[model samples]
Structures are given as C-alpha cells and as structure tokens.
Target chain A: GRPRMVDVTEKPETFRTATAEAFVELTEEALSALEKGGVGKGDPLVVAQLAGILAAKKTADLIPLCHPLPLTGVEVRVELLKAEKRVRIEATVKTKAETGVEMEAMTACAVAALTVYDMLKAASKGLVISQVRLLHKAGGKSGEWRR
Target chain B: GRPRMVDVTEKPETFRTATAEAFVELTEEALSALEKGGVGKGDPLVVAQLAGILAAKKTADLIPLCHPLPLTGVEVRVELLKAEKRVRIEATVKTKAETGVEMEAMTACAVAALTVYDMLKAASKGLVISQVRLLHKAGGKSGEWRRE
Candidate 1:
C-alpha cells in the first residue's frame, strides 16, 4: 500500500489524554525470582515504569506519520499480579495538539512491557507479553472511548 | 520502586532478532472508510507501517532502561482483516548487541498500531487495540521461544 503521513495541519489543536496497559505472564518460578531478585539498577518494575514515560515523549519520532504534538505529561506504573503470575504495565499520556496521544500511551505501555521482560528474562525463559491495549481516552473533538 | 538501566557494557555483542504483532479491532464503517479513504498523504496502513520501522531504531530513546545498540534492520507491515473487522501490525527487528531486540520489535508494533488509530479516529470512536505480544524471538543465550 502507498504510504503517507496524515495531515493534521488544520485539525485545531486541543487537549487530549490516552491511557493504555499491557500484560506479561511470567512462570511461577520467574515471578517469584523477580520479586526476590534485586539488581544494582533496582526493581525491574520501576525500570519498566520509567521506560513507559520516556516512550511517550518519543512517540512522534517512532511513528513515522505521528504528529509531534506538545506533550504535557506522562505517567507509567508497573505492578505484579501474583495470583495471575503476570505483570501489568499502565501508561497515561497527555498532550495539547491537533491529534490525540493514543500512540504515545500505546508506545509507553509496550516499551514498559518489553523492559520488564528484559530485566526478568533471567528468572525464566517463558515470559509472555500480551494484551497491549488502550484502556481509555479523554478529551478531543471526537469525545472519549473506554474499553 | 527505583529505576535503573540494566548493565550490558561488558556482555558480548551478538546477533538477535524479535518479532511482534498487535491487533486493532475496527468498526465495519471505520474499516471501510480506511480502505476507501486516501488523502494527499496516502494510505493510513502504509504510514503506520513506516512508523513501526522508524520506531524500532528509536527504542533506546523511548525506553529509559533500553541500551543504545547496533540496530541492523527493522521491518513492519500493517494489514486489514475484513472478516475479523481488525487490523494487524507486524514488526521484526534485528540487532547486534548485548541485549535482544524484543523491545525494538514491540516498540515497532505499538507505534504502528497507534498511528493507525490516529489516522482513523475520525471514522469511528470505538476502535479497540489488543494482543500486543511478541510472536517469536531468536538469538542470545535464550535460544528461541514461540507463543504456545
């Protein structure tokens, strides 16, 4: 298919936020090891959390056609779901621009998830990433969406 | 929790590759609009596809803990599944470094998916993104793993 960047030159800049999440399933052994293991760099969850925030600001650069909007804020968190043997990555991104920050949020969550796998791969070889999805969106002319 | 970039300075650099995919469920109308809609910029799918490839090289910058590595190559594709009312984002990334390219692949897929949504939000308000997962990985000491 032919490629092109969508034009947002006249879309009227506005405020918007997008939140996304991803899940990574770990083996019981891996999960336990992750909790107990501490590295010179600190917790895997935090490292991944920071990764998500940083990713939001880099959204425009990563996505070829994504507009480089003015990003206002980005927050990310990583937490373990012990019973489910999974880790959840949450990312929220805000911007005032012609387009929404869904890409930023999605990028944030995805990077966080991958960072977790990178830090914890030693715990087990079966870490499975999944459910990379937008949880909610607010502001913008089209209104909001929740899933 | 504290944050830190993992130490990989002394680890031997090697060739590694990872592939990932993401699914975006679109409404019937939205999908139709996407296929038919073409602007001065061109098809949304291609734009998104290009986005994925670019995102791979930017992984280290986006992900705080990600190490700057030798990115050998990156490929991304965006395709429509009419019957499924969905779009799929596929990304493959190769690198020569101490770490795997899973993050690069994942970043590739995620950016592509988001770019698709950005271009099509005007057509529908209910698009749902899901299944952001690594489909396959190879290289490094871990060998290989596939979704079972």
Candidate 2:
C-alpha cells in the first residue's frame, strides 16, 4: 500500500494567522510615470492590492504539499516607498484549523508583485520582484513568530 | 531555437475585466451544521469568503498558461442556496492589460470552495465541488462572454 500518513482525526484545532511581504524595484522612468498617473495603462498599485489578497487563498493549489486550511480572513495592502523607489506588498491570512496559513500569505505577496511587473512592462521591462519573505505568523504547532 | 510570442510593443493597452463562478455542494448534514454554526472546527462560510478573495490574485501563478495581470479590483461573494444545499461563489477581477483574467477569477472560486470542504471534512467528507466555470469576461482581443 502507498504510505498514507495516519489521519489527524484526533488532532486538536487552533486559530492561525500568517503575514508575508515582498518588494518590487522599479526603474526611475517607470516610478515617475506611476507617480504622475501616466503609466498609459492604468494604476498598478490598486490592481496589485486586489491581486495580492486573491493570491493568498489560492496558495494551496499553487504549491504542492500544502494542506488546504479554511481561511477566516485575508488582507493585502500595497505601499509605495518613494524614498526606496520600491513597492512594498504585505499579505495577512487567518484561519481556524489544525494547519497554518503561512504559505498562503507568502504566495500572495510573491504573485501580486509579479502582477505589478506584468502590468508595468511597457514602462520598464526590467521590473524586479524581490525580497519575498514571511514577516510573522501565529497559531499552529509553531506557536508564534515575528521578524 | 524556442518559439516565442510575438512582441506587442506597438499595441495599445486596454482595460480588462473578468468574472467567474463555482459551487461547492455539501451534504445535507454539512449544510445544516454550517447553517447553525455547529461545525466543531469553526465557521466555514467566513473562511471560504476570505479564501476566495486570496485565490483570485494567485490565478496567474496557479494556472501555468495564464498571464500575470495587475488586477485593479477583485470582489468575491458567496451565497448559500438553502434549497439546493449548495454554496455558490463568484469572483470578479478587473485589470488593464493585454490578457484577460478569466482564469484568475475561476481559480479563486475553486480555492474558496476547497477551503470550505477542508474545514468541514471532520463533519462530513462527502462534499463535492463542481461547476467551476468562467461566467463572464471583458476586454482583451478575444472580447466578452456571457454564460449560456
């Protein structure tokens, strides 16, 4: 028989939340165009925010070996760090289950940043989606984390 | 040499929007249990709502052939058809790009439904997910769609 792990029929449920962040670096021309609302296409920031939140819930299907936990809430926010010339994306996910939603939040940030690049390629084809990492997570067997 | 897509450098951009819908059919037991908020795990409806919104944005990454688009807006709403004992999920995505976001919206509905089942499996494992389809799409060269 294929080795199927023992079921979690007896496992206790718990509340969980995870937050992740990613960044995208833009060319001076692209950044300027974006600030002036002159991308010629549309606003990337608004679209990215919408895409980021949607990405979090779809994480299980995107990544293998992830347990699909029912998520209670998910929020995605994008901020323009003008001084750093970058877009900061943050995704937070919450669930009440035996598993954690960290992967969901991380996937959301990564995918959302990629979307920004896709929409802005005309202004700057070299847009860089970078620095995707877990910022914090609470609940599950690991307890809590913040960084 | 690898085949490559024709460059669209000269093409003008366009605004695009897509909407998709899907459903999760739960057992009568699971449906009633959810209605009364009696699922031992938690509330499946709220969880599914949040999950649906999150799933829509990850559409590009999850579907290999889909293009990543900067989505301008996304809205996901779930309605329970009590008589049919099913949950209907709808995801709408708006973007201004060369490609349509139909896949993204469809993927969102699918993920949200899956999350619902995952939460309620302890109560009932017979939940079935079906009718995951693109309900409507606008923009792009291919143009619009209205479900038949």
Candidate 3:
C-alpha cells in the first residue's frame, strides 16, 4: 500500500484504551532547579500533564491517517525521580472509536517529555528524552497487546 | 496548583525550526511481512511520513497548553534500517509563530512511529518504539539548543 491516511470510513466504533510512557533524564543541578521552581499555578509538571491529556483529543489531527472520534478520558502522570534525576511520564487514553488510541497515549507521553525539556532548558541543556513507547492497547481488531 | 493552557495571546511571531526523532524496532517476521505486503497506493513509511507532516500542523490541537500558530514547513523522513531491524523517523517543523514547535516535531515523530506499528502489528505484536526526543530547536527567546 502506498502511504495515505488508512481508510477508516467503514470500521465500526468500539471501546478502546491505550497507555504509554517516556523518561526524561536530567542533571542533578537541573532536577533541583526544576523541583525548587515547582510553585503555585506556575508548576511545569502540571502544565505538561495537561498537555498530555489534551494530546489524546488531538491524535486524529496529529496523525494523517487517523480518524476523528470521541475520546472518553485521558490521564497523564508526570512524576519526578528525585534520586535518579529523571522525570517519568505516563498516559492512559480511553475512547470509543474504530481505531485504537495508541498514538494518542504515545503522543501524550512524548509531548509531556518535551514540556519538561522546555521548562528546564534554561537551568540545564542536558535533558535526554528516552523510551517513548506504548505500554498497552486494548479493544481493537487484534484484541490487546502489552509491553 | 491547577493546570491551564499556556497563555499565547500576547506572544510575537518568529521563525523557528524544531526537529525530533523516534526509532521503531520490529521482529524479523514482521519486517519481512512488511517488505512483502503492499496492498495500497503507498508504503507504510510513506503513510507514516505523511502522517508526521500532518502532525506538525496539529501540535497546538494536540498539546493543551500549546498555542496555535501558522507553520511555514513540515518535513518527515521515515527510513527502514534493514540491517538493524528498526525504522527511523525524523521530523523537522518550520514555523513563524508565537510559541515553539517542539511538540509539533515530537508529535510528528511519535505519530509516524505509531502508524508504522499500526501497519505492521498484524505481522508481529513485538514491535517496540524508543528514543523519542527533540534533536534540536532554534529561533526563540533563548536561541538555539541541540543535544550533544
């Protein structure tokens, strides 16, 4: 098949859920800077977490071949690894659509990871984003997959 | 504190390019099946490539705090690393907008990678994605930055 938006004009809608995760490793100096600045409504992690949830709703717009469908829920967890100087990102997306929400969940994690970089770049430019991968997916033609 | 969208109503437009990457590893069975399966007018890589370019234009929609802005260009490169059994996805987003396009580029790479999995998942459920990160970003209040 030559690449184009995979046709989704005929698939029946069904319940779906997908989850993904990513990691951002930073220097100790950067981590402390980030932790100290975590204040008020100006928190970076909060902003990043919200960004991930919204990404779930925008997966169709973000993926050329994806179909626009209603999203039931989107959860994003942004946790700091204070000891390891790492930030872990997790996202769970739920929907009732013809296609699975793997991309949505994946997009959420990736975007959140980037947000962390954006917030901490001034403190340290050494942030490394890694392992943006889907952890699980269910309610599709092929059933479910876990990694 | 509660979360809210980033305020972009007061920012100015400027040219910026944000580039990002992702790698997808597939099983040998899936790789061979992908190479042989061609049932459409496009290849999976091409499909994924187009998906990424489109994704660059939708970053604001995808990221809650991201501001919507006009993009000058969006490029996505998807390649099959046959020897390594992995596919590489690269996206460079050019935009003259109030905010940065890092999400756009990362969004492009991530979506393209997922499309690859969608295309080949039937062959193998063991496909793995890794290393999604911003390679470089230029043109902002802080200037250029790259991973070393």
Candidate 4:
C-alpha cells in the first residue's frame, strides 16, 4: 500500500474556492429567544464565526490523511432563517496550493454548527444540527461538484 | 513554509479500519413513524447506507491532510435505540494503507446522519443531529484514539 502524494508541480496555478453549507433547526422557543436577543453564551453569530475560522486552521489535525495546505481565506456567515426557524451556516475557503480547500470549508461549517449548539444548549437542549453539506467546490484536478 | 509530504514510504502497511458514530434524535412521533415504516422517503436505512459509502469515498475531498486511500470496504449501520428515542448511525471504513481511515469513517457518519434527516423530514420537521464524531481509529502513526 503506497501512500504517495500526487505531485502537482506541473499543474497550472488557479484561484480556487470551495463553499460548504450547514444548519441547525431550533424550536420556536429557541428562535424567539434568539430574536429577542435573550439567548445566553454571548453572541451566537460572533462565536460561531470565530470558531469556524479556528476549525479551518485545525483541519489537518482533525482529519487523517489530509495534507496541511496554506489557506488564503476562510469566510463564515451565520444567518437566521426565520421561515424554517433555523440558523444557516455557510463557509467559503480559498487557497493557492496543490490540493483544493474543500475540507477546510466543510470544517468551517461543522465548527460553526457546533458553536451554535453550544451557545443555545442552555436555553433549548433540543437543538438539532441538520443539513451539513458541500454546496459547491471549484479547483484542483476535479473541476467542480455541486450539491 | 515547506509543504513536504511526510514520507510514508518507510511506514509499515497495515489493514486499518475505523468506526465513527453519529446520532439524530427524532421527535417521538417521528420515531414511531420510522419504526412502523411510515416515513414517505422509502427506507431510511437503505438510503443512509448508500450515502455513507459514498461519503467514505468523498472524505479525501472534504478533509484536509487525508490521503486518497483506496477503500476496501465501507459499511454503515443504523440501530434504532428505542429507549433513547434516537437513531445511532455508525460507519466503518477499511483500507490497506500507511495511515488510518479515521476521516473516511467520520465523513461516512456525517453523511449518513444527513441522509436520515432528509428521509424523515416529512414525518417530523424537527430532527436534531448530534454527536457526529469519530468513535475509534486504529492503525496509523498515532496508533489509536477512542472517544471517552
């Protein structure tokens, strides 16, 4: 079993970006509290954004067999989806490396979702993390994969 | 910064496997419907199974530092824990490589949990996904790490 890295010395350089999406559905009780600015644990959006960036940096450590690529950018956004009564999490990662940055993007979403759960667990212990997925990826040998 | 691949050329080859666990706590109504095969999206377990295997292959794409290992086997099982009123999803990934199959297994678990949500959304709109993490990993530079 040879575990050789794909030598990409000859591959052309290109600006690469990957986006991942995730969310957690909150009960009506949880949603009302958040809307009224009553949920505890500080600001949920701020905490989740910071945690998402941190998770992107820790991608290599958390996942096995993944190469530690230098990330150029990691952007996370948390928005309240009132219709669904959910918190939507989006993470976009940019990198100039031999490999793409999809993993970092996905990690960002996962960590953001976890942060939201932590923030609201005290108020509503029944929050559920749902719909974490790769929305789109553009870069590397594989051109793109969209969900 | 030197982006040198740690030379696994000297690493011993091993038959490695890992198991990752994730759960989604459905509402009482959803649990009852699932058990009675009342959900509308076909069989939840079957859909989750296919999703888990596909997710194992996608691990390399979704996780940084993970090598693209040829997977020998990938299996996911969902055990309905009626007492807890939750679905326990477990993914086992097998590979013959220098590093362990932790991320592959973990990704499988994550994807399986997502599939469960997609399948059961009709029965109960409120499903909570929790505990999506690695359960145990064996055969790698770090040996093993089991969740405590």
Interface DockQ of each model: 0.07, 0.02, 0.06, 0.02
Q: Candidate 2's residue-wise lDDT over A11-126, tens digit each? A: 78677888899999989987887797647667788777777766775677788667765455667778789999999988877765677778988998998898888768888998
lDDT string for model 1 (B44-109, tens) is 798899988898877877776565555778889899988898899999888666678899999999
RMSD of each: 19.0, 19.3, 18.1, 14.3
Clashing pairs in 2: A47-B71, A53-B54, A54-B53, A54-B54, A54-B55, A54-B57, A55-B54, A55-B58
- Chain B alone: TM-score in each candidate? 0.93, 0.89, 0.91, 0.85
Candidate 1: pairs in clash: A64-B51
Best by TM-score: 1
lDDT of 1 by residue, A18-102 (tens): 8899999988777877778633346888678887777776777789978775455667878999888899988877655678889
Question: Which residue pairs clash in candidate 4?
Answer: A65-B65, A65-B66, A65-B67, A66-B64, A66-B65, A66-B66, A67-B65, A103-B62, A128-B128
Model 2 CAPRI quality: incorrect
Stronger candidate by DockQ (2 vs 3): 3
Real interface contacts reproduced by model 2, as a fraction: 0.00
* Candidate 3 Cα errors over 4 Å, as ranges: A38-41, B1-148
Chain A vs. true chain A, TM-score per candidate?
A: 0.93, 0.90, 0.91, 0.88
Query: Model 1: residues >4 Å from true position, as ranges?
Result: A1-147, B38-41
Question: For candidate 4, lDDT tens digit of each residue in A54-91?
Answer: 99988866764455566788889988899988999999
Over 4 Å off in model 2, which ranges? Answer: A1-9, B1-148
